[PDB]
CSV table of C-alpha atoms in Angstrom, one decimal:
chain,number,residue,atom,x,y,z
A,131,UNK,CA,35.1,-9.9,16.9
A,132,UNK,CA,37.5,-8.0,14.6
A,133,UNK,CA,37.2,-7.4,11.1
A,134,UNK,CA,40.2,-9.4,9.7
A,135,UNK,CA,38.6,-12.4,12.0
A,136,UNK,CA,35.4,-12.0,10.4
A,137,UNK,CA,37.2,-11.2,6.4
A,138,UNK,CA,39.0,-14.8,7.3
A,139,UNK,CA,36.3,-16.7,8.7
A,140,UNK,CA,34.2,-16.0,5.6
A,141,UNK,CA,37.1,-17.0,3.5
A,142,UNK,CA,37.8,-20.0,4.7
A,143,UNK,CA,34.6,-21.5,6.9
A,144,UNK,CA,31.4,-23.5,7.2
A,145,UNK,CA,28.1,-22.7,6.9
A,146,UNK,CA,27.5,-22.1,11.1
A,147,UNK,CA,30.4,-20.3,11.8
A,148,UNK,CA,29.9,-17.9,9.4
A,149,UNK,CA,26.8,-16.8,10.6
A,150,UNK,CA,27.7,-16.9,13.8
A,151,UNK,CA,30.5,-14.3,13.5
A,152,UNK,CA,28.1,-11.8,11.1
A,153,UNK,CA,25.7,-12.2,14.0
A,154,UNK,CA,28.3,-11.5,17.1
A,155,UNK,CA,29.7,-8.8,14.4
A,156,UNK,CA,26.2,-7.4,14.1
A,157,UNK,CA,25.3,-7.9,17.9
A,158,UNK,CA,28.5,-6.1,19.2
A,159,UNK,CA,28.3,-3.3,16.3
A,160,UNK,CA,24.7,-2.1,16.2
A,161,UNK,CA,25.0,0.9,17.6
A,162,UNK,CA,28.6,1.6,15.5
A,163,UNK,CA,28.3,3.4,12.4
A,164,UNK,CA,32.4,5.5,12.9
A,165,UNK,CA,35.2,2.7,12.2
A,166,UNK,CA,39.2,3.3,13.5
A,167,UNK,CA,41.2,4.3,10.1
A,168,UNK,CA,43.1,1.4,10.8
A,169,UNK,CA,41.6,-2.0,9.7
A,170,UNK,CA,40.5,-0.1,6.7
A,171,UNK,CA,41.9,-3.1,4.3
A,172,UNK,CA,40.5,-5.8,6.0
A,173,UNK,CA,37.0,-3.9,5.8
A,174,UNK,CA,37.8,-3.7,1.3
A,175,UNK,CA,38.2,-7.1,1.7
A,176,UNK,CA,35.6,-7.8,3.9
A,177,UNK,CA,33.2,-5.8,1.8
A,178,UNK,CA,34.3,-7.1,-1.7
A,179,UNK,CA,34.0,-10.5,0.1
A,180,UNK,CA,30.3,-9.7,1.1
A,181,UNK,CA,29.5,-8.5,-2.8
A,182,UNK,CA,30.7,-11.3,-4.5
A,183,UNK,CA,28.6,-13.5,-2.2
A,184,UNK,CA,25.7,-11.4,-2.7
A,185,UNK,CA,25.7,-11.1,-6.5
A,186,UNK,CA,26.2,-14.9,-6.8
A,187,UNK,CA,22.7,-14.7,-5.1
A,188,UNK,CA,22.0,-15.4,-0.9
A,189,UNK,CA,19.9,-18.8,0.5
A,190,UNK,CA,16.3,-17.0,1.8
A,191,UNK,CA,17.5,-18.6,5.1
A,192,UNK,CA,20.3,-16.0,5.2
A,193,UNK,CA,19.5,-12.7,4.5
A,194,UNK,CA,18.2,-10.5,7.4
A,195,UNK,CA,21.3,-10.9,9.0
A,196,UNK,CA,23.4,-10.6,5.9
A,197,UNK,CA,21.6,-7.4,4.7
A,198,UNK,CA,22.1,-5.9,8.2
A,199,UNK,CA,25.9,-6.7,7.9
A,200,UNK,CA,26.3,-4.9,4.7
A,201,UNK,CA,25.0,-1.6,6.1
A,202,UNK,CA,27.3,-1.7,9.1
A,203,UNK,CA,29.6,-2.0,6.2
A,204,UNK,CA,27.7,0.6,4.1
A,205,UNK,CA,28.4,3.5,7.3
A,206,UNK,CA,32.0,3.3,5.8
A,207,UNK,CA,33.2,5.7,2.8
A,208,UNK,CA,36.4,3.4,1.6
A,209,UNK,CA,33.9,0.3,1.6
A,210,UNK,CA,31.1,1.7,0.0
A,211,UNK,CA,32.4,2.0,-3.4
A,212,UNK,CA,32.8,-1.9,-3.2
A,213,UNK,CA,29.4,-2.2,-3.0
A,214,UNK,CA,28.4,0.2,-5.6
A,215,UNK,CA,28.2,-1.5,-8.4
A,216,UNK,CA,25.1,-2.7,-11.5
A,217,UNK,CA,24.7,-6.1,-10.1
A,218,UNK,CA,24.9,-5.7,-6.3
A,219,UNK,CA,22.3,-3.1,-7.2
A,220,UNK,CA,20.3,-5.4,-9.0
A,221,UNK,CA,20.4,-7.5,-6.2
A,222,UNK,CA,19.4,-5.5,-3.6
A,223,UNK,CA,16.5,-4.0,-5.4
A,224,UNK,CA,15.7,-7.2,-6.3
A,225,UNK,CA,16.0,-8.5,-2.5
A,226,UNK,CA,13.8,-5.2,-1.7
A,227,UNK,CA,10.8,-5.9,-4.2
A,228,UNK,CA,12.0,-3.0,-6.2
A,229,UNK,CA,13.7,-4.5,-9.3
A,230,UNK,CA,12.0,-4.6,-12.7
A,231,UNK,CA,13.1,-8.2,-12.9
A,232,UNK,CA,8.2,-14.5,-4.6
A,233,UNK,CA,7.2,-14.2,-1.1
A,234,UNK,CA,8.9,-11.1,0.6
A,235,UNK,CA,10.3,-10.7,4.5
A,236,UNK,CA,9.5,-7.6,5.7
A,237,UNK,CA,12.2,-7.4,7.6
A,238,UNK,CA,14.6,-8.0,4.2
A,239,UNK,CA,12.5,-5.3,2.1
A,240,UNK,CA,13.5,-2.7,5.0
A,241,UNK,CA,16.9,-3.7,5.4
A,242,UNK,CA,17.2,-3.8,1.7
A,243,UNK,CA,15.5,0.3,1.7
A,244,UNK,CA,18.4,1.0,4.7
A,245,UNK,CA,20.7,-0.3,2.8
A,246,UNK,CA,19.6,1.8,-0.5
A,247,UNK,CA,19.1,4.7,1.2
A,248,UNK,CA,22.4,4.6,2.5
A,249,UNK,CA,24.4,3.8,-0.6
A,250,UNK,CA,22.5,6.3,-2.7
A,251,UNK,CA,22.3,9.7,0.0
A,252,UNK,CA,26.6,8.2,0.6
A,253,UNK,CA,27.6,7.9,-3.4
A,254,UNK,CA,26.6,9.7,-6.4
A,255,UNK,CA,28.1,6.5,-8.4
A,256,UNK,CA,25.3,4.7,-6.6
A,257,UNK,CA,22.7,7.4,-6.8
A,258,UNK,CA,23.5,7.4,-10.9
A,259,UNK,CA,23.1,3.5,-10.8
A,260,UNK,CA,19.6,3.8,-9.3
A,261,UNK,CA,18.4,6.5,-12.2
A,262,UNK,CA,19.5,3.9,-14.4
A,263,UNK,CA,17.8,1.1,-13.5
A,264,UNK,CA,14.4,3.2,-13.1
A,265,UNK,CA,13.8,2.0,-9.1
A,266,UNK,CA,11.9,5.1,-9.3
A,267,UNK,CA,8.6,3.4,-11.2
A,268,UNK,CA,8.0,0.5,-8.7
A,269,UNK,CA,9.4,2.8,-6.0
A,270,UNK,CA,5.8,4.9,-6.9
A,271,UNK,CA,3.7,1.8,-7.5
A,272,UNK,CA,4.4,0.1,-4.0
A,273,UNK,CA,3.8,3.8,-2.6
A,274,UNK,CA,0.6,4.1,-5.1
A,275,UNK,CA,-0.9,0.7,-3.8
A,276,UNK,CA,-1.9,2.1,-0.7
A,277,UNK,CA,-5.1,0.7,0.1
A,278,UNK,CA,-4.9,-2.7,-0.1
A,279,UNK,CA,-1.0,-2.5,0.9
A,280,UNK,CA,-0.8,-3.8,4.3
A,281,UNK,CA,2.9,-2.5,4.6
A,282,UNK,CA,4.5,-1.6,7.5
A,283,UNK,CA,5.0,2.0,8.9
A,284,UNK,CA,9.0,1.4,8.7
A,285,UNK,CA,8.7,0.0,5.1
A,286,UNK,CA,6.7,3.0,3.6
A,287,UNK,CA,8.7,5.6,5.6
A,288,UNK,CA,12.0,3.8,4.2
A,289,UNK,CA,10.3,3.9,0.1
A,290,UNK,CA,9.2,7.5,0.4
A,291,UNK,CA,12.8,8.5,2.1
A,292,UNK,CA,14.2,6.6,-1.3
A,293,UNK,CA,12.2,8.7,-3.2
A,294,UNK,CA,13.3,11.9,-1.3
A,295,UNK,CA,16.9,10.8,-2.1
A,296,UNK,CA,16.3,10.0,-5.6
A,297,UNK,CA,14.4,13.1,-6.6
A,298,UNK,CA,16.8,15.3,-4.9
A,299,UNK,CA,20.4,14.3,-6.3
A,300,UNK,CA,19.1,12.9,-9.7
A,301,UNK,CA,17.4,15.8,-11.7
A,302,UNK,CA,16.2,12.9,-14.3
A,303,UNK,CA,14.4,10.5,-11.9
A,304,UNK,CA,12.9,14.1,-10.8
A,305,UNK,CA,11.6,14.9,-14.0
A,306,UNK,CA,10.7,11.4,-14.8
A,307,UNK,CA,8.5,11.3,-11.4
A,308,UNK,CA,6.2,14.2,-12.3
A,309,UNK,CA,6.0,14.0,-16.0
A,310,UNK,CA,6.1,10.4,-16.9
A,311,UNK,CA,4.6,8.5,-13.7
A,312,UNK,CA,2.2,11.7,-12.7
A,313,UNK,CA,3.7,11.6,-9.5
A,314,UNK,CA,2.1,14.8,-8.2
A,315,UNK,CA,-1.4,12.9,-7.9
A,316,UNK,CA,-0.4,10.0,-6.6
A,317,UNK,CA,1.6,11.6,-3.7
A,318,UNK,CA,-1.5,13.9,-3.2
A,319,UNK,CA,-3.5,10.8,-2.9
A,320,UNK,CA,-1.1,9.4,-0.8
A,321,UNK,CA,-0.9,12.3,1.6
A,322,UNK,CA,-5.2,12.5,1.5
A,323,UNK,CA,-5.2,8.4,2.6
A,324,UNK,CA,-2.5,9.5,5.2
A,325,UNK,CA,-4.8,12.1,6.8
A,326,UNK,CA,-8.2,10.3,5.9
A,327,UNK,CA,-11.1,14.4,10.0
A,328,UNK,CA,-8.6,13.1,13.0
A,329,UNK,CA,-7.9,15.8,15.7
A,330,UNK,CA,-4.2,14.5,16.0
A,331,UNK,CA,-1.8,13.2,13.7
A,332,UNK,CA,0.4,10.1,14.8
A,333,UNK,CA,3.8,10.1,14.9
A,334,UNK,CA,4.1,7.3,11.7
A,335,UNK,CA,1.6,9.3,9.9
A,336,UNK,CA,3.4,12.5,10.8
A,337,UNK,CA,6.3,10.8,9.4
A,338,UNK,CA,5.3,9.2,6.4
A,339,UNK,CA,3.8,12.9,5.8
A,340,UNK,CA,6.2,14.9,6.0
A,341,UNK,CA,8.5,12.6,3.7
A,342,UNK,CA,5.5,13.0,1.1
A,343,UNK,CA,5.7,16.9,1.6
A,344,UNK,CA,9.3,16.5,1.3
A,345,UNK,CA,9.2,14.3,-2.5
A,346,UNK,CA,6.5,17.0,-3.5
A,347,UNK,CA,9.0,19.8,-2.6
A,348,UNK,CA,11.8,18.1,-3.9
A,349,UNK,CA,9.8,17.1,-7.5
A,350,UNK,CA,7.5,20.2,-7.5
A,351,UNK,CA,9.7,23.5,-7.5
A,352,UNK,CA,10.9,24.2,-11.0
A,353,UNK,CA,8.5,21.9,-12.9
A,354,UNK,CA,5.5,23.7,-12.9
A,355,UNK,CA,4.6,26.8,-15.8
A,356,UNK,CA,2.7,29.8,-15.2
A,357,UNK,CA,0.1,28.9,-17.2
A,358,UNK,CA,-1.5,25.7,-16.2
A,359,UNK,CA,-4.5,23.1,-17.3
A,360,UNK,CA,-7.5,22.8,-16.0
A,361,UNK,CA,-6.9,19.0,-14.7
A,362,UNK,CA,-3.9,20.5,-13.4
A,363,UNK,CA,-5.5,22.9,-11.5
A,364,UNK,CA,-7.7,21.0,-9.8
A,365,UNK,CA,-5.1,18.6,-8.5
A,366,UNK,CA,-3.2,21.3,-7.3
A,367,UNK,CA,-6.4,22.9,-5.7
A,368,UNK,CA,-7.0,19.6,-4.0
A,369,UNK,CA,-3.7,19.1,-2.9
A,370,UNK,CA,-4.0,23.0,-1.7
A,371,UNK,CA,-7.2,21.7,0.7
A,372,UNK,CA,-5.2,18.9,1.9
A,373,UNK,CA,-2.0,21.6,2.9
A,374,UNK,CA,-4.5,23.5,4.5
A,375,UNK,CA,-5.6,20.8,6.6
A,376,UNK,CA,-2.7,20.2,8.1
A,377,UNK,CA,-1.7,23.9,8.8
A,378,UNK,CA,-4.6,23.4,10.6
A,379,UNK,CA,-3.4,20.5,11.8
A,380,UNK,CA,-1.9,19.2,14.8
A,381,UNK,CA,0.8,16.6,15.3
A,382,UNK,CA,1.7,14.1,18.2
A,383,UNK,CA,5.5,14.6,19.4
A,384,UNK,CA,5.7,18.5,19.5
A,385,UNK,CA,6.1,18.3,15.3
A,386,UNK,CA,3.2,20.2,14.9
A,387,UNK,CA,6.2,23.1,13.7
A,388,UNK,CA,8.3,20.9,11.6
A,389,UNK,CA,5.0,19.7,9.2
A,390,UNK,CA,3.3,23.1,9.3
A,391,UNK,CA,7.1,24.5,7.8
A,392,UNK,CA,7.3,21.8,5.2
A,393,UNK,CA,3.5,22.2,4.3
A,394,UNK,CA,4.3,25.7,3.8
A,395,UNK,CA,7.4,25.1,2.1
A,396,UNK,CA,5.3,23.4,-0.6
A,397,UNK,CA,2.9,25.9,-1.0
A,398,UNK,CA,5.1,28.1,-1.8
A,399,UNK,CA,5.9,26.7,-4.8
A,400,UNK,CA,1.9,26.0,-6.0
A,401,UNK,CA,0.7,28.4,-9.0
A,402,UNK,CA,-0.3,31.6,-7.2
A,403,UNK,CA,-3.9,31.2,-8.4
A,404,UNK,CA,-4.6,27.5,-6.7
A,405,UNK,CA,-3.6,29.4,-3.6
A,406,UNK,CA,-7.4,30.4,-3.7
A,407,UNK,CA,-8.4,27.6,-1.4
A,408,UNK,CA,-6.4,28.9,1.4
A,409,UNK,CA,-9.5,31.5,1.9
A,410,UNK,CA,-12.7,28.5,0.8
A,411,UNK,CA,-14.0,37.4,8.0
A,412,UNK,CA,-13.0,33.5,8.0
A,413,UNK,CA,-9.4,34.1,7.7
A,414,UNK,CA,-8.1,31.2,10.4
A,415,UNK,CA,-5.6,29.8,8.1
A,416,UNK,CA,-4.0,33.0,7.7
A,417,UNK,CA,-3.9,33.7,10.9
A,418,UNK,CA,-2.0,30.2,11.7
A,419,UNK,CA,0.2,31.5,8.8
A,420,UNK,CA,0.7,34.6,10.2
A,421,UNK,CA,1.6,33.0,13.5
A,422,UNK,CA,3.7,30.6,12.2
A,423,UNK,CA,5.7,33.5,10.5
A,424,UNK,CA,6.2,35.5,14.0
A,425,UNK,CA,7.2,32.4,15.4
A,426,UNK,CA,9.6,31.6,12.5
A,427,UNK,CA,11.1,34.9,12.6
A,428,UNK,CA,13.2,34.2,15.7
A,429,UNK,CA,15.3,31.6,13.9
A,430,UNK,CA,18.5,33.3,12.9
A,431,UNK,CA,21.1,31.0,11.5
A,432,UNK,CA,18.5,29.9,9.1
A,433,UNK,CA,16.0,32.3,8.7
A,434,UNK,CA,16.1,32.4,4.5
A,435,UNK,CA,15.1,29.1,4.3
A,436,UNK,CA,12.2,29.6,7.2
A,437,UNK,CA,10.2,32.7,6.6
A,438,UNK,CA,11.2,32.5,2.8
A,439,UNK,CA,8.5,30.6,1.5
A,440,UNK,CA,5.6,31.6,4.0
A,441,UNK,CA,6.5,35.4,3.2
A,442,UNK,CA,5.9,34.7,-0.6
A,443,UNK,CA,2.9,32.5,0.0
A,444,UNK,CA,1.9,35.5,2.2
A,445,UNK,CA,2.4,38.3,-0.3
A,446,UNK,CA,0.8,36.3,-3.1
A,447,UNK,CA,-2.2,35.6,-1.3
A,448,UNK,CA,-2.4,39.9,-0.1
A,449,UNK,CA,-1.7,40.3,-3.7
A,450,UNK,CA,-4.7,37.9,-5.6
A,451,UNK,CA,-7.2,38.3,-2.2
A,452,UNK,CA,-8.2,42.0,-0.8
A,453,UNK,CA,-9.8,41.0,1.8
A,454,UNK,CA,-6.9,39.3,2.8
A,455,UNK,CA,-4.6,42.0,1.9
A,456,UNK,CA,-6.8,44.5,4.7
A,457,UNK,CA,-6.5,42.3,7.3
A,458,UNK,CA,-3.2,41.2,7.1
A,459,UNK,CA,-2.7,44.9,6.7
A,460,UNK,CA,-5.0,45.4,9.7
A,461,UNK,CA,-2.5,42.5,11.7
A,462,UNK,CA,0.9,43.8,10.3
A,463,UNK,CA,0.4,47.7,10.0
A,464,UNK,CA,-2.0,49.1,12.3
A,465,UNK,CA,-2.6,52.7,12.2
A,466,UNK,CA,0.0,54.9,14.0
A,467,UNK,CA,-0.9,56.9,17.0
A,468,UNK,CA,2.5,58.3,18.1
A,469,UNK,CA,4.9,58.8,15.0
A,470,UNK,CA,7.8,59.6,17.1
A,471,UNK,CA,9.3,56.0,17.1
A,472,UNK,CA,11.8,55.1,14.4
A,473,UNK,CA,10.1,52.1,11.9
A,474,UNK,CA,14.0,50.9,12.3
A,475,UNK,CA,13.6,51.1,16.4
A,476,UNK,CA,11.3,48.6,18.6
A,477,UNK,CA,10.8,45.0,19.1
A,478,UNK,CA,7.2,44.9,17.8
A,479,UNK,CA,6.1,42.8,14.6
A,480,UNK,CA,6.7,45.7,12.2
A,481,UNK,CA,10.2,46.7,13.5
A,482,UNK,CA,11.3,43.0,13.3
A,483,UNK,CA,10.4,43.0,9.7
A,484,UNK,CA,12.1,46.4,9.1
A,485,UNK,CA,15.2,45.4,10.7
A,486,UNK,CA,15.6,42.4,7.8
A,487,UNK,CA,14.9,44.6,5.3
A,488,UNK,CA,18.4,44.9,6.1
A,489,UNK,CA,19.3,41.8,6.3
A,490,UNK,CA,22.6,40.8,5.0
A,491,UNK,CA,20.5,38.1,2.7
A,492,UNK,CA,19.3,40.4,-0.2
A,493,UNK,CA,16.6,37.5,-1.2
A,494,UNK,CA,15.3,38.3,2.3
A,495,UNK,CA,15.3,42.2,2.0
A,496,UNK,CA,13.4,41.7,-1.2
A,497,UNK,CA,11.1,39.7,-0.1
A,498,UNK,CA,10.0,41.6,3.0
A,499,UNK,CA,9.9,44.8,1.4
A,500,UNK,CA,7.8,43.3,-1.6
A,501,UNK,CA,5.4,41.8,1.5
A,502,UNK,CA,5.2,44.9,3.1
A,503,UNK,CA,4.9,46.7,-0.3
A,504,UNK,CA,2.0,44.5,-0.9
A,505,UNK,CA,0.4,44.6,2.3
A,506,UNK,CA,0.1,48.6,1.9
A,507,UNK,CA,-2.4,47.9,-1.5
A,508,UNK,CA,0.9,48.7,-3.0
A,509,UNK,CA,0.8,52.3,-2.2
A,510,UNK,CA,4.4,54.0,-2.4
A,511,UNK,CA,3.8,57.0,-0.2
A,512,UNK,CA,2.2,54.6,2.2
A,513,UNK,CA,5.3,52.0,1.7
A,514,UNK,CA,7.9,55.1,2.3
A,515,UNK,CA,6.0,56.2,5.5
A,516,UNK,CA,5.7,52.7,7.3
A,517,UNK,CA,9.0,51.6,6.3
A,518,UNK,CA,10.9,54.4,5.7
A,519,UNK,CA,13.8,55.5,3.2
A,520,UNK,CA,16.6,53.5,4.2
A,521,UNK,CA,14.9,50.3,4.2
A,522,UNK,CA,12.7,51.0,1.0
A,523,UNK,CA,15.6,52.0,-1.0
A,524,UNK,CA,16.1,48.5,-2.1
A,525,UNK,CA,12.9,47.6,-3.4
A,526,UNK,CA,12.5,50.9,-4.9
A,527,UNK,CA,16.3,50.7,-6.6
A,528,UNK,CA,15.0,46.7,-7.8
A,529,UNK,CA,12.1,48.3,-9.7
């Protein structure tokens, strides 16, 4: 029932009533992740309790419901650096199938990936303990097996939300990810085995997608040159014709939004030139593009991070594409018939955009005015008269 109950019965009890209180513990606390700052010592003790046990090494018998217990311990701060430490790590990755160092419960590998998850997104000790013991290479194989792995949708959800976590607070397993291990191909086959030409995605898939769209933003971003190979290239042009099949893409669950932003959040960090299959007129996926702007324009708290990166893919594909350039040109600035209204004044498509050219985010001015800039076959008399002086001072000012 309580936590001192539980600390004591551990201490001093049998092999039943052990297990019977972690299971009336887990039972009553399922659904309890916030703890009263008051039995905060008899957690420590519970939790250095629970370490010692588990780096002296569990029965197979008694796991699921240990592992469990742990993460209801692991959703508190002052216990978790009792379980951050080289061999409770050791243990759990070895419990989860991850470990360098036997059959495997399914239900104990995603307990073990909870558990993992938690420690590392909860403590950077823990997060620096998994670079070190390189979780990161059989993380990739188990995720790279993908044909004949039979694993289930919660255990490969759980591995690529691991590798989200790892690649995002440890710039070295990053780094190790897409140079060492080639990540960026196998993700890209992942993500092509995930889609395989179905009309709707489901919501695992949709999931297990969008964590691979998250890794490849999270390991693609700042480790790609502007001059790349030709291998290179083609992988990123395939992974380009998979991103464009799923803008074009539909998912189940009313996510449809959610993986068409982080598609596009990855494309816009592709080399500007293997942004050529987004046109392979017939200029549908633009227009999605182009829709999914409009409709990420209304977002206002965060707008930067929303029409950021579908602006720049946008600008760079009016800028390598003229046919593109004239109709999104065509879409964006049609020619004016009465030049009486303000560019500044409106609620149209074109006054939206003018209006965050003065936007208090100069990231955001700079990239709408070098969109619209763009858009006008970079034309400064034509910039000045569709956008006017006040709002074209900054990008003329930048350059």
């Amino acid at each position: 029932m309580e936590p001192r109950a539980v600390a004591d019965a551990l201490e001093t009890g049998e092999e039943d009533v052990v297990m019977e209180a972690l299971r009336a513990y887990n039972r009553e606390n399922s659904q309890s992740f916030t703890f009263d700052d008051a039995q905060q010592e008899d957690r420590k003790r519970l939790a250095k309790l629970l370490v010692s046990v588990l780096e002296q090494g569990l029965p197979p018998s008694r796991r699921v419901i240990w592992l469990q217990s742990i993460r209801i311990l692991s959703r508190d701060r002052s216990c978790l650096d009792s379980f951050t430490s080289r061999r409770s790590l050791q243990a759990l990755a070895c419990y989860a199938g991850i470990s360098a160092s036997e059959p495997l419960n399914m239900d104990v590998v995603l307990e073990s990936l909870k558990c993992l998850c938690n420690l590392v997104l909860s403590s950077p000790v823990a997060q620096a303990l998994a670079a070190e013991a390189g979780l990161v290479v059989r993380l990739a194989e188990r995720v790279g097996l993908c044909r004949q792995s039979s694993f289930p949708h919660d255990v490969q959800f759980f591995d690529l939300r691991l590798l989200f976590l790892l690649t995002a607070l440890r710039t070295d397993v990053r780094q190790q990810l897409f140079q060492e291990l080639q990540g960026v191909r196998l993700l890209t086959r992942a993500l092509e085995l995930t889609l395989g030409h179905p009309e709707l995605l489901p919501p695992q898939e949709t999931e297990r997608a969008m964590e691979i769209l998250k890794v490849l933003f999270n390991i693609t971003f700042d480790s790609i040159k502007r001059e790349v190979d030709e291998e290179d290239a083609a992988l990123y042009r395939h992974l380009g014709t998979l991103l464009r099949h799923c803008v074009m893409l539909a998912a189940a669950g009313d996510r449809t939004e959610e993986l068409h932003g982080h598609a596009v959040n990855l494309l816009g960090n592709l080399p500007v030139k293997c942004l050529d299959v987004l046109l392979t007129v017939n200029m549908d996926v633009i227009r999605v593009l182009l829709s999914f702007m409009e409709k990420r324009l209304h977002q206002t708290h965060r707008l930067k991070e929303s029409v950021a990166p579908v602006l720049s893919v946008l600008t760079e594909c009016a800028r390598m594409h003229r046919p593109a350039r004239k109709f999104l040109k065509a879409q964006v600035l049609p020619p004016l018939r009465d030049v009486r209204t303000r560019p500044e004044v409106g609620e149209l498509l074109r006054n939206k955009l003018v209006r965050l050219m003065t936007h208090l985010d100069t990231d955001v001015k700079r990239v709408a005015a070098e969109f619209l800039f763009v858009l006008c076959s970079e034309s400064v008399p034509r910039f000045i008269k569709y956008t006017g002086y006040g709002n074209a001072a900054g990008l003329l000012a930048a350059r």
